[PDB]
Coordinates of C-alpha atoms (C1' of nucleotides) and ligand atoms in Angstrom, one line a residue:
Chain A
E1 CA -4.8 -38.9 52.6
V2 CA -4.1 -36.2 49.9
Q3 CA -0.7 -34.8 50.1
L4 CA 2.3 -32.9 48.1
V5 CA 5.7 -33.7 48.2
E6 CA 8.3 -30.9 46.5
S7 CA 12.1 -31.8 46.3
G8 CA 15.2 -30.5 44.4
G9 CA 15.8 -28.1 46.3
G10 CA 19.0 -25.9 46.5
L11 CA 21.9 -24.2 46.5
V12 CA 22.3 -22.9 42.5
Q13 CA 25.0 -19.7 41.4
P14 CA 22.7 -16.5 39.6
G15 CA 22.6 -17.5 36.3
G16 CA 22.7 -21.6 36.8
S17 CA 19.4 -23.3 37.0
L18 CA 17.5 -26.1 39.2
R19 CA 14.2 -28.1 38.1
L20 CA 11.7 -28.5 40.8
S21 CA 9.9 -31.4 41.5
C22 CA 5.9 -31.9 43.3
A23 CA 5.4 -35.5 44.3
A24 CA 1.4 -36.6 44.4
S25 CA -0.7 -38.8 46.5
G26 CA -4.3 -39.6 47.4
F27 CA -5.3 -37.9 43.5
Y28 CA -4.4 -37.8 40.3
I29 CA -3.3 -34.4 39.2
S30 CA -4.8 -34.7 35.6
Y31 CA -8.2 -33.4 37.4
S32 CA -6.6 -30.5 38.8
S33 CA -5.1 -27.5 38.5
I34 CA -1.4 -26.9 40.2
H35 CA 0.2 -23.3 41.0
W36 CA 3.4 -22.9 42.7
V37 CA 3.8 -21.0 45.0
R38 CA 6.7 -19.2 46.6
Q39 CA 7.5 -17.5 50.0
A40 CA 10.7 -15.1 50.7
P41 CA 12.4 -15.8 54.4
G42 CA 10.4 -12.9 55.8
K43 CA 8.0 -11.8 53.2
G44 CA 5.0 -12.8 52.1
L45 CA 3.7 -15.5 49.3
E46 CA 4.3 -14.3 45.8
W47 CA 2.0 -16.5 43.0
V48 CA 4.4 -18.1 40.5
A49 CA 3.3 -20.0 38.2
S50 CA 0.3 -22.7 37.5
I51 CA -0.7 -25.1 34.0
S52 CA -4.5 -25.8 33.7
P53 CA -5.9 -29.1 33.0
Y54 CA -7.2 -31.0 29.7
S55 CA -6.0 -28.3 27.7
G56 CA -2.7 -27.7 29.6
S57 CA -2.3 -23.6 29.7
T58 CA 0.3 -22.9 32.0
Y59 CA 0.5 -19.1 33.7
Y60 CA 3.0 -17.3 34.7
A61 CA 4.0 -14.4 36.9
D62 CA 6.0 -11.7 35.0
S63 CA 8.6 -12.2 37.1
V64 CA 9.8 -15.5 36.4
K65 CA 8.4 -15.5 33.1
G66 CA 10.5 -16.6 29.9
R67 CA 13.0 -17.9 33.2
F68 CA 10.7 -20.5 34.8
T69 CA 8.3 -23.2 33.1
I70 CA 6.0 -25.3 34.8
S71 CA 4.6 -28.9 33.2
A72 CA 2.9 -31.9 34.4
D73 CA 4.2 -36.0 33.9
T74 CA 1.3 -37.9 34.9
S75 CA 2.7 -40.8 34.2
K76 CA 4.7 -39.8 37.4
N77 CA 1.8 -37.9 38.8
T78 CA 4.4 -35.0 39.1
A79 CA 4.8 -31.4 38.8
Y80 CA 8.4 -30.1 37.8
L81 CA 8.9 -25.8 37.8
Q82 CA 12.0 -25.5 35.4
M83 CA 13.8 -22.4 36.4
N84 CA 16.2 -21.2 33.8
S85 CA 18.6 -17.8 34.9
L86 CA 17.8 -17.6 38.7
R87 CA 18.5 -14.8 40.2
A88 CA 19.3 -13.6 43.7
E89 CA 15.7 -12.4 44.4
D90 CA 14.4 -15.5 43.2
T91 CA 15.8 -17.5 46.8
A92 CA 12.7 -18.4 48.2
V93 CA 10.8 -21.2 50.3
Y94 CA 8.7 -22.8 46.8
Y95 CA 5.4 -24.5 47.7
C96 CA 3.4 -26.1 44.9
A97 CA -0.5 -26.2 46.1
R98 CA -3.4 -28.2 43.7
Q99 CA -6.3 -25.9 42.9
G100 CA -9.0 -27.7 44.9
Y101 CA -12.2 -29.1 43.0
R102 CA -14.7 -26.4 41.7
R103 CA -17.6 -27.1 43.0
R104 CA -16.1 -28.1 46.7
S105 CA -13.4 -25.0 47.4
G106 CA -13.9 -22.6 44.3
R107 CA -10.5 -21.8 43.0
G108 CA -8.6 -22.3 46.0
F109 CA -5.6 -24.3 46.6
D110 CA -7.0 -26.8 49.3
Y111 CA -3.1 -28.4 49.8
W112 CA 0.1 -27.7 49.9
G113 CA 3.5 -29.2 49.7
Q114 CA 5.5 -28.8 53.2
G115 CA 8.5 -26.6 50.8
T116 CA 11.5 -27.2 49.0
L117 CA 13.9 -24.3 49.9
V118 CA 15.8 -22.6 46.8
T119 CA 18.3 -20.5 47.5
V120 CA 20.2 -18.1 45.1
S121 CA 24.0 -16.8 45.6
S122 CA 28.0 -16.6 44.7
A123 CA 28.4 -17.8 48.4
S124 CA 30.9 -21.2 48.5
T125 CA 28.4 -23.9 50.6
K126 CA 30.4 -23.5 54.1
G127 CA 30.6 -25.5 57.4
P128 CA 29.6 -23.2 60.8
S129 CA 31.9 -22.1 63.4
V130 CA 30.9 -22.6 66.6
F131 CA 31.5 -20.1 69.7
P132 CA 30.6 -20.8 73.3
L133 CA 28.4 -17.8 74.8
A134 CA 29.8 -18.5 78.2
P135 CA 27.7 -17.7 81.0
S136 CA 28.4 -15.0 83.3
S137 CA 30.4 -15.1 86.2
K138 CA 28.5 -12.7 88.9
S139 CA 24.7 -12.7 90.3
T140 CA 22.1 -13.7 88.1
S141 CA 19.6 -11.4 85.8
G142 CA 15.9 -12.5 86.7
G143 CA 16.9 -15.5 88.8
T144 CA 18.9 -17.3 87.0
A145 CA 21.9 -17.8 84.1
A146 CA 22.1 -18.2 80.6
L147 CA 25.1 -19.7 78.1
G148 CA 24.8 -20.7 74.6
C149 CA 26.9 -20.9 70.8
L150 CA 26.8 -19.1 68.4
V151 CA 26.8 -20.0 65.1
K152 CA 28.4 -18.4 62.6
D153 CA 29.9 -18.0 59.3
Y154 CA 26.8 -20.4 58.0
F155 CA 25.9 -21.1 54.1
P156 CA 23.6 -22.2 53.0
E157 CA 20.7 -22.6 55.3
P158 CA 19.7 -23.8 57.3
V159 CA 21.0 -25.4 60.5
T160 CA 19.2 -26.9 63.2
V161 CA 20.7 -26.7 66.7
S162 CA 20.1 -29.0 69.8
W163 CA 20.9 -29.5 73.9
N164 CA 22.7 -32.3 75.8
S165 CA 21.4 -34.6 72.5
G166 CA 17.6 -33.5 72.7
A167 CA 17.6 -33.9 77.1
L168 CA 17.6 -30.4 76.8
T169 CA 15.0 -27.9 75.8
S170 CA 13.4 -26.0 78.7
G171 CA 13.6 -23.0 78.8
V172 CA 16.2 -23.5 74.9
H173 CA 16.0 -20.2 72.6
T174 CA 17.3 -20.7 69.4
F175 CA 17.5 -17.5 67.7
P176 CA 16.3 -17.0 62.8
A177 CA 19.4 -16.9 60.4
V178 CA 20.7 -13.6 59.7
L179 CA 22.7 -13.0 56.7
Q180 CA 25.8 -11.5 57.3
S181 CA 26.8 -8.5 54.9
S182 CA 29.1 -10.9 54.3
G183 CA 26.5 -12.5 52.8
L184 CA 27.0 -16.4 55.2
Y185 CA 24.8 -17.0 57.4
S186 CA 24.5 -16.7 61.3
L187 CA 22.2 -17.0 64.4
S188 CA 23.1 -18.1 68.2
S189 CA 21.3 -20.2 70.7
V190 CA 21.2 -19.6 74.1
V191 CA 19.3 -21.0 77.0
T192 CA 19.0 -20.1 80.9
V193 CA 20.2 -22.5 83.7
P194 CA 20.5 -22.4 87.3
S195 CA 23.6 -20.3 88.2
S196 CA 24.5 -22.9 91.7
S197 CA 25.1 -25.6 89.3
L198 CA 27.0 -24.0 86.1
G199 CA 29.9 -25.9 87.4
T200 CA 28.7 -29.3 88.2
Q201 CA 26.7 -29.9 85.2
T202 CA 27.2 -30.5 81.7
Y203 CA 25.9 -28.3 79.3
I204 CA 26.6 -28.9 75.4
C205 CA 25.3 -27.4 72.3
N206 CA 24.5 -29.8 69.2
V207 CA 24.8 -27.4 65.9
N208 CA 23.9 -29.4 62.5
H209 CA 25.0 -28.6 58.9
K210 CA 24.1 -31.1 56.7
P211 CA 25.2 -29.1 52.8
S212 CA 28.5 -28.8 54.4
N213 CA 28.2 -32.0 56.1
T214 CA 29.1 -30.3 59.3
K215 CA 28.2 -31.5 62.5
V216 CA 29.7 -29.9 65.9
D217 CA 29.3 -30.3 69.2
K218 CA 30.5 -28.0 71.9
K219 CA 30.0 -27.6 75.3
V220 CA 29.6 -24.5 77.0
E221 CA 31.7 -24.3 80.6
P222 CA 32.3 -20.8 82.5
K223 CA 35.5 -18.7 81.2
Chain B
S1 CA -2.9 -4.1 35.0
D2 CA -2.6 -6.7 37.6
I3 CA -4.1 -7.1 39.9
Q4 CA -3.2 -5.0 43.7
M5 CA -4.7 -7.0 47.3
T6 CA -3.6 -4.0 49.8
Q7 CA -4.3 -6.5 53.1
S8 CA -4.9 -4.6 56.5
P9 CA -3.6 -4.1 59.3
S10 CA 0.0 -6.1 59.3
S11 CA 0.4 -6.9 62.5
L12 CA -2.8 -7.3 65.2
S13 CA -2.6 -8.5 69.2
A14 CA -5.7 -9.4 70.6
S15 CA -6.3 -11.5 73.8
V16 CA -8.0 -15.6 73.8
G17 CA -11.6 -15.4 72.9
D18 CA -11.3 -12.0 70.8
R19 CA -13.1 -11.0 67.7
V20 CA -10.9 -9.7 65.2
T21 CA -11.4 -9.3 62.0
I22 CA -8.5 -8.9 58.6
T23 CA -9.1 -6.6 55.6
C24 CA -8.1 -6.9 52.0
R25 CA -9.3 -4.5 49.5
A26 CA -8.3 -5.1 46.2
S27 CA -7.7 -2.6 43.1
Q28 CA -10.6 -3.9 40.3
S29 CA -13.2 -5.9 40.7
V30 CA -12.5 -9.8 41.3
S31 CA -15.8 -10.6 41.0
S32 CA -15.8 -13.5 44.8
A33 CA -12.9 -15.3 43.8
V34 CA -10.9 -14.5 47.6
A35 CA -9.5 -16.9 49.3
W36 CA -8.2 -17.0 52.9
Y37 CA -5.4 -18.8 53.7
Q38 CA -3.6 -19.3 57.8
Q39 CA 0.3 -19.9 57.8
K40 CA 2.1 -21.0 61.0
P41 CA 5.9 -20.6 61.3
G42 CA 7.9 -23.0 59.0
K43 CA 4.6 -24.2 57.9
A44 CA 2.6 -24.4 54.9
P45 CA -0.5 -22.5 54.3
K46 CA -3.9 -23.4 55.3
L47 CA -7.4 -22.7 52.9
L48 CA -9.7 -20.8 55.3
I49 CA -12.1 -19.0 52.7
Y50 CA -12.9 -19.9 49.5
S51 CA -14.6 -17.5 47.5
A52 CA -15.6 -15.0 49.8
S53 CA -17.5 -16.2 52.1
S54 CA -18.1 -20.0 51.9
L55 CA -15.9 -21.7 54.6
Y56 CA -13.9 -25.0 53.9
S57 CA -15.0 -28.4 54.5
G58 CA -13.2 -29.0 58.6
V59 CA -12.2 -25.5 59.0
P60 CA -14.1 -24.5 62.3
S61 CA -17.1 -21.9 61.9
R62 CA -15.5 -19.0 63.9
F63 CA -13.6 -18.4 60.8
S64 CA -15.9 -16.1 58.6
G65 CA -15.3 -14.3 55.6
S66 CA -17.9 -11.9 53.6
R67 CA -17.4 -9.2 50.4
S68 CA -18.1 -5.5 49.9
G69 CA -17.7 -4.8 47.1
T70 CA -14.3 -5.4 46.0
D71 CA -13.6 -5.0 49.9
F72 CA -12.7 -9.2 51.4
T73 CA -12.8 -9.2 55.0
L74 CA -11.4 -12.3 57.5
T75 CA -14.1 -12.8 60.7
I76 CA -12.4 -14.9 64.4
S77 CA -15.5 -14.3 65.9
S78 CA -13.5 -16.2 69.0
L79 CA -9.9 -16.6 69.4
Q80 CA -9.1 -19.9 70.1
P81 CA -5.0 -20.2 70.7
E82 CA -4.7 -22.2 67.9
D83 CA -5.8 -19.1 65.7
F84 CA -2.4 -17.5 66.4
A85 CA -0.6 -17.4 63.0
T86 CA -0.5 -15.3 60.0
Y87 CA -3.6 -14.9 57.3
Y88 CA -3.3 -13.8 53.8
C89 CA -5.7 -12.7 51.1
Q90 CA -5.6 -14.4 47.9
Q91 CA -7.3 -13.5 44.4
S92 CA -8.1 -15.3 42.1
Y93 CA -10.2 -13.7 39.3
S94 CA -7.4 -13.6 36.6
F95 CA -3.8 -14.5 35.6
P96 CA -2.2 -13.7 37.8
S97 CA -3.2 -14.1 41.2
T98 CA -2.8 -11.4 43.9
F99 CA -1.6 -12.3 47.7
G100 CA -2.5 -9.9 50.5
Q101 CA 1.0 -9.0 52.1
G102 CA -0.6 -10.7 54.9
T103 CA -1.9 -10.6 59.0
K104 CA 0.1 -11.9 62.2
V105 CA -2.1 -11.9 65.0
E106 CA -0.2 -12.0 68.3
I107 CA -1.9 -13.3 71.4
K108 CA -1.7 -10.4 74.1
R109 CA -0.7 -11.2 77.3
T110 CA 0.9 -9.2 80.6
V111 CA 3.6 -7.2 80.7
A112 CA 7.2 -8.8 81.2
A113 CA 10.9 -6.8 81.8
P114 CA 13.8 -8.8 79.7
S115 CA 16.8 -10.4 81.0
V116 CA 19.4 -8.9 80.6
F117 CA 23.2 -11.0 79.5
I118 CA 26.2 -10.4 77.7
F119 CA 28.5 -12.3 76.2
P120 CA 32.2 -11.3 75.6
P121 CA 33.8 -13.3 72.5
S122 CA 35.4 -16.2 72.7
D123 CA 39.1 -16.1 72.6
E124 CA 38.6 -19.3 69.7
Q125 CA 37.2 -16.5 67.6
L126 CA 39.5 -13.5 68.7
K127 CA 42.2 -15.6 66.9
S128 CA 40.6 -15.4 63.5
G129 CA 40.6 -12.1 62.7
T130 CA 37.0 -11.5 63.8
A131 CA 35.1 -10.5 68.2
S132 CA 31.5 -11.1 68.3
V133 CA 30.0 -9.5 71.3
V134 CA 26.1 -11.0 72.1
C135 CA 23.2 -8.7 73.6
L136 CA 20.2 -10.9 75.5
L137 CA 16.6 -9.9 75.5
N138 CA 15.5 -12.8 77.4
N139 CA 11.7 -13.8 78.1
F140 CA 9.6 -10.1 77.8
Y141 CA 6.7 -8.4 76.4
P142 CA 5.6 -6.7 74.3
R143 CA 8.6 -7.2 71.1
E144 CA 8.7 -3.5 71.6
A145 CA 11.7 -3.3 72.9
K146 CA 15.8 -0.4 72.1
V147 CA 18.7 -2.4 72.3
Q148 CA 22.1 0.0 72.7
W149 CA 25.6 -0.9 71.8
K150 CA 28.4 1.4 73.6
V151 CA 32.3 0.8 73.8
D152 CA 34.3 3.0 76.3
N153 CA 30.4 5.2 76.4
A154 CA 31.3 6.0 72.0
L155 CA 27.4 4.6 70.5
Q156 CA 27.6 2.1 67.8
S157 CA 26.0 1.9 64.6
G158 CA 26.2 -0.2 61.8
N159 CA 27.8 -3.1 63.2
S160 CA 24.7 -4.4 65.2
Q161 CA 22.5 -6.9 64.0
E162 CA 19.2 -7.8 65.7
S163 CA 17.6 -11.6 66.0
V164 CA 14.1 -12.5 67.7
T165 CA 12.2 -15.5 68.2
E166 CA 8.8 -16.3 67.4
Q167 CA 6.2 -15.7 70.7
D168 CA 6.6 -18.2 72.9
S169 CA 4.0 -22.1 72.9
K170 CA 3.8 -21.1 76.6
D171 CA 3.9 -18.2 78.3
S172 CA 3.3 -15.7 75.1
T173 CA 6.8 -14.0 75.9
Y174 CA 9.6 -12.9 73.2
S175 CA 13.2 -13.2 73.1
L176 CA 15.8 -10.8 71.0
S177 CA 20.0 -11.2 70.0
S178 CA 21.6 -8.9 69.6
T179 CA 24.7 -9.4 67.8
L180 CA 27.8 -7.0 67.5
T181 CA 30.4 -7.6 64.8
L182 CA 33.8 -5.5 65.5
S183 CA 37.1 -6.5 63.7
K184 CA 40.0 -8.0 66.0
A185 CA 42.1 -5.0 65.7
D186 CA 39.1 -2.0 66.4
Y187 CA 38.3 -4.8 69.8
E188 CA 41.4 -4.5 71.7
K189 CA 41.5 -0.9 71.3
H190 CA 38.9 -0.3 73.5
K191 CA 38.4 -1.4 77.4
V192 CA 34.6 -1.3 78.3
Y193 CA 31.9 -2.9 76.0
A194 CA 28.1 -1.6 77.0
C195 CA 25.0 -3.0 76.2
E196 CA 22.0 -0.8 76.7
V197 CA 18.2 -2.2 77.1
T198 CA 15.4 -0.3 77.2
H199 CA 11.8 -1.9 78.0
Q200 CA 8.7 -0.8 78.3
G201 CA 8.6 -3.3 81.7
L202 CA 12.2 -2.2 83.0
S203 CA 12.1 0.6 86.1
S204 CA 14.5 1.9 84.1
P205 CA 17.0 1.5 81.2
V206 CA 19.5 -1.6 82.3
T207 CA 22.5 -1.7 81.0
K208 CA 25.0 -5.5 80.9
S209 CA 28.4 -5.0 80.8
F210 CA 31.8 -6.4 81.0
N211 CA 35.5 -5.5 80.3
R212 CA 37.6 -6.2 77.8
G213 CA 41.1 -7.6 79.9
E214 CA 39.5 -9.0 82.8
Chain C
rG1 C1' -85.6 -20.1 -13.9
rG2 C1' -82.5 -25.2 -12.8
rA3 C1' -79.3 -29.1 -14.5
rC4 C1' -75.2 -32.0 -17.6
rG5 C1' -71.3 -30.2 -21.2
rC6 C1' -67.6 -27.3 -23.4
rG7 C1' -64.2 -22.7 -23.1
rA8 C1' -62.6 -18.1 -21.2
rC9 C1' -61.1 -14.4 -17.3
rC10 C1' -61.3 -14.5 -11.5
rG11 C1' -59.5 -16.9 -7.8
rA12 C1' -56.4 -20.9 -5.6
rA13 C1' -53.7 -25.0 -3.0
rA14 C1' -48.6 -26.8 -5.0
rU15 C1' -44.1 -24.2 -8.1
rG16 C1' -39.7 -22.8 -10.5
rG17 C1' -37.7 -18.0 -11.2
rU18 C1' -36.8 -13.8 -9.0
rG19 C1' -34.7 -9.1 -4.9
rA20 C1' -35.0 -6.2 -0.8
rA21 C1' -35.8 -7.0 4.6
rG22 C1' -31.7 -8.3 10.7
rG23 C1' -33.8 -10.3 15.4
rA24 C1' -41.0 -8.8 15.9
rC25 C1' -40.5 -14.6 10.6
rG26 C1' -37.4 -18.1 12.3
rG27 C1' -32.6 -22.3 13.0
rG28 C1' -28.1 -22.3 13.3
rU29 C1' -23.2 -20.1 14.3
rC30 C1' -20.0 -16.8 16.8
rC31 C1' -19.5 -13.9 21.1
rA32 C1' -20.2 -12.1 26.6
rG33 C1' -21.8 -13.3 31.3
rU34 C1' -23.2 -16.8 34.7
rG35 C1' -23.7 -22.2 36.5
rC36 C1' -22.0 -27.5 35.6
rG37 C1' -18.9 -31.2 33.9
rA38 C1' -12.7 -33.6 38.3
rA39 C1' -12.7 -28.5 33.7
rA40 C1' -10.8 -19.9 35.4
rC41 C1' -7.9 -20.4 28.7
rA42 C1' -9.4 -24.3 24.8
rC43 C1' -13.2 -28.6 24.3
rG44 C1' -18.5 -30.0 26.0
rC45 C1' -24.2 -29.2 28.2
rA46 C1' -27.7 -26.3 30.7
rC47 C1' -28.7 -20.4 31.7
rU48 C1' -29.2 -15.8 30.4
rG49 C1' -28.2 -11.6 26.9
rU50 C1' -29.6 -8.8 20.7
rU51 C1' -29.1 -1.1 24.5
rG52 C1' -24.3 -8.4 22.1
rA53 C1' -23.5 -10.3 15.8
rG54 C1' -23.9 -8.9 7.8
rU55 C1' -29.5 -8.8 5.4
rA56 C1' -22.6 -7.3 -0.3
rG57 C1' -24.1 -13.3 3.9
rA58 C1' -18.1 -13.9 6.8
rG59 C1' -24.3 -21.0 6.2
rU60 C1' -23.5 -28.5 4.1
rG61 C1' -30.0 -23.3 5.0
rU62 C1' -29.2 -17.8 2.8
rG63 C1' -34.3 -22.2 5.9
rA64 C1' -40.0 -19.7 6.2
rG65 C1' -42.3 -15.2 4.8
rC66 C1' -43.0 -11.3 1.3
rU67 C1' -41.2 -7.8 -3.5
rC68 C1' -41.9 -9.4 -9.0
rC69 C1' -42.6 -12.8 -13.2
rG70 C1' -44.4 -17.3 -15.4
rU71 C1' -46.3 -23.0 -14.5
rA72 C1' -50.3 -25.2 -11.6
rA73 C1' -54.4 -29.1 -8.7
rC74 C1' -59.1 -27.3 -7.8
rU75 C1' -63.2 -29.5 -4.2
rG76 C1' -64.3 -22.8 -6.5
rG77 C1' -66.6 -17.9 -8.1
rU78 C1' -68.6 -15.7 -12.1
rC79 C1' -69.2 -15.4 -17.3
rG80 C1' -71.3 -17.1 -22.5
rC81 C1' -72.4 -21.3 -25.9
rG82 C1' -74.2 -26.0 -26.6
rU83 C1' -78.4 -29.3 -25.1
rC84 C1' -82.1 -31.3 -21.4
Ligands
2ZY301 C1 -22.6 -12.5 11.5 C2 -23.2 -12.4 12.4 N1 -24.6 -11.8 12.5 C3 -25.7 -12.9 13.6 C4 -26.3 -13.0 13.7 C5 -27.6 -12.8 14.8 C6 -28.3 -13.3 15.6 C7 -29.5 -11.9 16.3 F1 -30.4 -13.1 17.7 C8 -29.2 -10.8 15.8 O1 -30.1 -10.0 16.8 C9 -28.0 -10.3 15.2 F2 -27.9 -8.8 14.7 C10 -27.5 -11.4 15.1 C11 -24.3 -14.0 13.0 O2 -25.2 -15.8 12.8 N2 -23.8 -13.9 11.7 C12 -22.8 -15.2 11.2 C13 -21.2 -15.6 11.8 F3 -21.4 -14.4 10.5 F4 -21.3 -13.9 12.5 F5 -21.6 -16.4 12.4
K302 K1 -29.4 -15.2 9.5

RNA sequence: GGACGCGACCGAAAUGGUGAAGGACGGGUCCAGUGCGAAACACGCACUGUUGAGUAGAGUGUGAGCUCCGUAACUGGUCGCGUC
């Protein structure tokens, strides 16, 4: 019944500003304390800010104090997080969490949003170049053969990869994106297949990078 | 002074049914204002314990919290397959709130040697000024693996990045990708491109490679 | 001896003025903590605390009591006088 939905996340260059929303449903935000908590990729959870009910008192972490402003629109039943003077270290996934009812959950955050991504960088939005990881010509390894696609030089996150439009899912591994020294992301998706049918069967990685309107389909054949 | 929450361990491997315990030690007194969360990859945190030892509604009773002074502990009496995730502690005794650095609990299993594959850079990318060589360690355990790059028997360093998947939902194995990045120029100067994999499940270190021209 | 009456002294319910006391005279208020109100702060309630708080009040009580100076019902006591 109760749910939280954050939006407004996206790419913004350093010094820029971004406004986050926290649409609530299944409950009234006026009766609860709303919190913002962010998580940089690979790191742990970091408390950002909050706002108390009835009093409207706000609280911020030192790392964001003076730049961030948390508010609440009861008319829209939505909480907002105004982020000004953004920095590269502000880059993370932003959650909105409800502070549960005291006699029931104490000061615990009983409900969390799905989180909205906020990337801060000077890098321009760029679609990825997809290259084939062609299956070796000789022998095997573990009993089969392997192939895949290299998704390189895209920005920002995220990107999705499928094989044969979702028909191929077994033995498929899509690795976590890695931020290159160039400021651009890069990742590879592979899949193990029988080396006996490398020629007679078709394998196609379906790459998808929406932030740049870049959807590509590359078929991976023996070179 | 901000209140510190020192969580430990940072990682943990246990079998299904095992009794595990995660600890968070506070720098100051936080009373009982301690919460425990569970987070799975790509998902939001889920509240497990509140007020140090109170079990949230709908949370299985195998999860239990306890407070000893400024030391708090999450206890999982018997691990179940759906229990393997990352757990964080939180203090909300005073602002600002403080989170533990997390504790990733991972499932144990029999040792599994990785299947190694090497992929030469595509002709399409080479005409772009950069060459990418990929080494693939596939389905192995534990995660502890060492991957080295050798071009013409020259050990590479500083020009490679690794990436590892989460523990697979079926066989609980890992997969890893090493990515060597070279210029088209430097790529053209040499012939034999090598990557050597050292893993516990391997009889001896395995080398997989090719020659640039052929 | 006794009764009644007058007066004085004393006592005295009551009352005006007065000036010392701080928590063992109280109430109010504030503060801290805890729990509660959909409620970490602010607001409100409840509980706890004076080794929490000014006897210059910081009170739309400095209220009660007491110190000290007066007025005083009287059903009071004593004494004198008049009368029976
Ligand atoms: C200044 C002060 N002190 C007070 C009260 C109090 C009550 C007790 F029971 C006690 O033991 C004590 F020492 C003081 C008090 O009420 N104030 C008033 C105000 F100005 F603060 F408002
Ligand atoms: K008083």
